[PDB]
Amino acid sequence: NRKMAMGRKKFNMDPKKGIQFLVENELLQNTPEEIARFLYKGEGLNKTAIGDYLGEREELNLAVLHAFVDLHEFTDLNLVQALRQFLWSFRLPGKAQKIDRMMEAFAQRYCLCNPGVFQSTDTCYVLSYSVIMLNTDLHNPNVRDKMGLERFVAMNRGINEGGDLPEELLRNLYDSIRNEPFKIPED
Amino acid sequence: MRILMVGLDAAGKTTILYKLKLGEIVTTIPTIGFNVETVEYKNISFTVWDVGGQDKIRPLWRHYFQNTQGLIFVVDSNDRERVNEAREELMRMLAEDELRDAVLLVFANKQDLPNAMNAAEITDKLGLHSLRHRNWYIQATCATSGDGLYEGLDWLSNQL
Numbered sequence: 001n002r003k004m005a006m007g008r009k010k011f012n013m014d015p016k017k018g019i020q021f022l023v024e025n026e027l028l029q030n031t032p033e034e035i036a037r038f039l040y041k042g043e044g045l046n047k048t049a050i051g052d053y054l055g056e057r058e059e060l061n062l063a064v065l066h067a068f069v070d071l072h073e074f075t076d077l078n079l080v081q082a083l084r085q086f087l088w089s090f091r092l093p094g095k096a097q098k099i100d101r102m103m104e105a106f107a108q109r110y111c112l113c114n115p116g117v118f119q120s121t122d123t124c125y126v127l128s129y130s131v132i133m134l135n136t137d138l139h140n141p142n143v144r145d146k147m148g149l150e151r152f153v154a155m156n157r158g159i160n161e162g163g164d165l166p167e168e169l170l171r172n173l174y175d176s177i178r179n180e181p182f183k184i185p186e187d
Numbered sequence: 188m189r190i191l192m193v194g195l196d197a198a199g200k201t202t203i204l205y206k207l208k209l210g211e212i213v214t215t216i217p218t219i220g221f222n223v224e225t226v227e228y229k230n231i232s233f234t235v236w237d238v239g240g241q242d243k244i245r246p247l248w249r250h251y252f253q254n255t256q257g258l259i260f261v262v263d264s265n266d267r268e269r270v271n272e273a274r275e276e277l278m279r280m281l282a283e284d285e286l287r288d289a290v291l292l293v294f295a296n297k298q299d300l301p302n303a304m305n306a307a308e309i310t311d312k313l314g315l316h317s318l319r320h321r322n323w324y325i326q327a328t329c330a331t332s333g334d335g336l337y338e339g340l341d342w343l344s345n346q347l
């Protein structure tokens with residue numbers, strides 16, 4: 001009925017309020033999994049609002065973030081391909097701690113979907129954060145003198161459980177981001 | 188020049204960056220990634236990043252900001268429960284080889300709050316008088332109004 005469309009608008013206006021309304025009106029079950037499924041489908045939802053909700057520090061929101069990541073399939077994708085898919089489903093917040101939690105959750109799922117590509121989830125998480133830093137450096141106009149490949153390779157030294165990642169991997173990621181920024185999501 | 192801005196969560200880093208965005212005449216098209224703002228003056232520019240916060244990513248900012256000339260540390264002047272933790276985190280930053288030549292600007296933020304520690308109290312509780320080989324300055328601020336922000340950046344210009 002009309003209540004669902006109202007809840008979506010409320011969500012866009014203030015995510016926690018939209019969720020409150022949908023739960024109170026028995027249109028959405030109050031579990032992390034059901035909220036995540038709602039956000040992943042994203043029907044009539046603003047991707048900035050989705051991202052803002054997924055980025056909140058609260059226990060429920062963190063559980064929703066993990067359940068949301070669980071709905072993504074990253075098998076047979078390289079790291080940048082998987083990040084592009086993930087970051088199309090919501091607008092990444094700018095606050096570093098929100099990005100950090102999102103990249104750690106992403107990395108756990110990436111590694112499960114692609115066993116053996118990275119030797120630890122920490123390596124994947126740190127590299128993913130590094131890729132966001134690269135997109136920022138290369139494509140944020142506030143940053144004047146862009147990072148070359150050599151400098152990006154150097155930025156990642158030591159993150160492979162104390163050692164280095166293959167140069168060819170870092171080159172492939174660098175080239176992909178340089179050629180195509182992470183797209184500003186359309187909803 | 189690139190400048191790293193750090194501080195405990197909720198210190199006011201995002202709020203500071205948003206105010207700095209408003210002061211600029213150059214408007215910027217949205218990008219995916221970290222909050223970064225360039226403040227442009229005639230003879231100097233500062234590109235301030237919020238990109239720290241967790242230990243496992245410290246190598247990335249150590250490398251990106253290697254040999255950088257300034258560091259901004261933001262503290263919530265009202266958070267007496269976490270001031271010791273802020274001091275410990277500041278001292279970790281100041282022990283990093285990569286930031287050895289950086290001057291330190293401390294924004295003692297949230298001075299609007301009625302029980303906020305004053306500048307002298309923050310200087311004491313962050314251990315700033317203990318620093319030997321560091322040029323440092325404490326700037327009282329209220330990030331929600333913008334007061335103190337350009338004054339602190341002026342000092343940083345006057346060191347750089």
Ligand SMILES: Nc1nc2c(ncn2[C@@H]2O[C@H](COP(=O)(O)OP(=O)(O)O)[C@@H](O)[C@H]2O)c(=O)[nH]1
Nearest residue numbers: 196197198199200201202296297298329330331
């Ligand atoms: N009263 C007061 N609140 C502030 C001030 N600066 C930031 N805040 C608030 O403190 C909270 C955390 O600020 P934020 O910029 O997100 O902190 P960050 O986690 O360091 O980025 C927000 O609710 C801000 O509105 C200030 O000077 N005074």
Ligand SMILES: O=S([O-])[O-]
Nearest residue numbers: 093094095201222
């Ligand atoms: O979290 S905000 O700065 O997009």
